Ligand binder design. Structure first.
Ligand SMILES: [Cl-]
Ligand SMILES: [Cl-]
Lengths: 216, 216
C-alpha cells in the first residue's frame, strides 16, 4: 500500500479535478490517497519538503527543483446578472478596459499571492485601474452577490458550473485573460503515479471534450 | 435616506435568496441595501444590537426577543458519488441509521451552532453516533470532495443545484430530516421593509412554482 499526498487549491474542486482524482483512485485501489488543501503559492515548498507529492494549482511559477506541467489554460468570463446592461456583449464578449467602472467583486480573501492579486495584475499590466473594487472572501459568495445585484465578477470558465442562478457569463476577449491549471511534481520524482494521473487527466479532458495542452 | 442591513448565511446564495433580494431592490430603489455575511447564531445578537435588520438563517435558533418567520423547509439529501454503494437507494431513499459508519463530511467551518452541529444533532436525537466525521470549511469544498471520493455529505435540497458533477442526492427519509429557511427580525421591529421583503419572498417562490408557508 503506497500513500499519495495530493495538494489542491479550492478553485479546482468545482472543475475537472475531483473526477480526475476519482478515476485515479478507482483504477489504483492499492494507493491510499490523502487530499490536502494547499495554496498554489505553498505547493512549491510543500513538494520540496516532501509534505505533498502532487500539487494541482494555478501555478505561474517555475522552480528549479519542480517539474511544472501545464495541463490547461482556462478562459476567464465576466459573471453578470442576466438583465445587466453588459448582456449586450453575451455573444461578442468584452475587453477589460470596458468594465473598469463597474462595481466589481474580487475574491478570495486569503494569504497572498492568490486569485485576487492575479486578477488585479491583469488590469495593471493592461494599464487599467478598476474604480469600484470590493473584496469578497470566496468565489461562491462573489457570484451570489452578483445575482443579488451587487455588481460583476471575473471568474475562470469552470466556475460557470457553480450553480448560482440568473447569471450570464461574458467571454473576456483579452489574450492574457486566462488562468492556468498546473500539475507540479518534484524533478527527482519518477513514480508511476505521475504518468498514471496524467493518463487520468487526458481521459477526463477527452470525456468533457476539452483539448489539453499536454500530449501523452 | 433608508438603509436596510441584511444578514445571510452564505450557502443560501445558491438558492432563491439572491432573486428575492434583486426583486426587493428593483421594487424599492430608494432603499439602500447592505448585504452582510452572518451565520444564523450570530444573527441573533446582530439583530439585538442593530447591526442587521433582517437575518436569513439556515437552522432553527430561537430567542425571546427575535421574531422568526419560517419561509420554507428544505428536505435533506445524502450527496454521494454516483458509484457509491448507497446508489442502490437512489430510487427510494435512506434513513440516517443506514449511514452511521460511512466516512462523512460536515460543513461549514464557521461559528457554531451551524449546519454541521444541526446534522450531528439529528444523529444524537436518534441515539446514533457517526463513526467517521470530517469538518470541511464550505459546502462547495465538501461536495467537490465527495466527487473526489472522500465520502458522503448530508445537504439540504437546494444543494442539488450547486453543479458539482458525478453526484447523486439520496432522499433522507426520517421525519426530522429537513432544514428551514427562516427570516429573523427583532420582535420590536415594525418597519416598512418587513412586509416588503416578505412580499418578495412570496413572489419569487410563486415565480418558481414553489409553495411557501407564510401568513401572507
Ligand atoms: Cl450552511
Ligand atoms: Cl449558520
Amino acid at each position: 500500500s503506497q500513500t499519495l499526498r495530493i495538494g489542491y487549491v479550492s478553485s479546482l474542486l468545482y472543475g475537472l479535478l475531483p473526477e480526475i482524482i476519482y478515476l485515479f483512485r478507482q483504477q489504483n485501489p492499492e494507493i491510499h490517497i490523502e487530499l490536502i488543501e494547499c495554496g498554489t503559492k505553498d505547493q512549491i515548498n510543500a513538494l520540496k519538503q516532501g509534505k505533498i507529492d502532487l500539487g494541482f494549482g494555478r501555478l505561474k511559477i517555475t522552480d528549479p527543483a519542480i517539474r511544472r506541467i501545464m495541463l490547461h489554460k482556462e478562459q476567464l468570463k465576466l459573471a453578470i446578472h442576466k438583465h445587466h446592461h453588459l448582456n449586450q456583449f453575451a455573444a461578442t464578449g468584452v475587453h477589460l478596459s470596458q468594465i473598469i467602472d463597474e462595481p466589481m467583486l474580487l475574491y478570495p480573501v486569503s494569504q497572498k499571492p492568490n486569485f485576487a492579486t492575479f486578477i488585479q495584475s491583469l488590469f495593471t499590466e493592461l494599464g487599467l485601474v478598476p474604480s469600484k473594487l470590493t473584496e469578497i472572501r470566496e468565489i461562491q459568495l462573489a457570484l451570489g452577490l452578483v445575482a443579488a445585484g451587487e455588481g460583476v465578477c471575473i471568474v475562470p470558465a469552470s466556475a460557470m458550473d457553480i450553480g448560482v442562478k440568473n447569471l450570464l457569463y461574458i467571454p473576456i476577449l483579452d489574450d492574457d485573460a486566462y488562468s492556468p491549471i498546473s500539475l507540479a511534481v518534484r524533478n527527482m520524482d519518477h513514480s508511476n503515479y505521475i504518468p498514471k494521473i496524467l493518463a487520468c487527466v487526458q481521459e477526463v479532458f477527452a470525456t468533457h471534450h476539452i483539448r489539453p495542452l499536454i500530449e501523452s
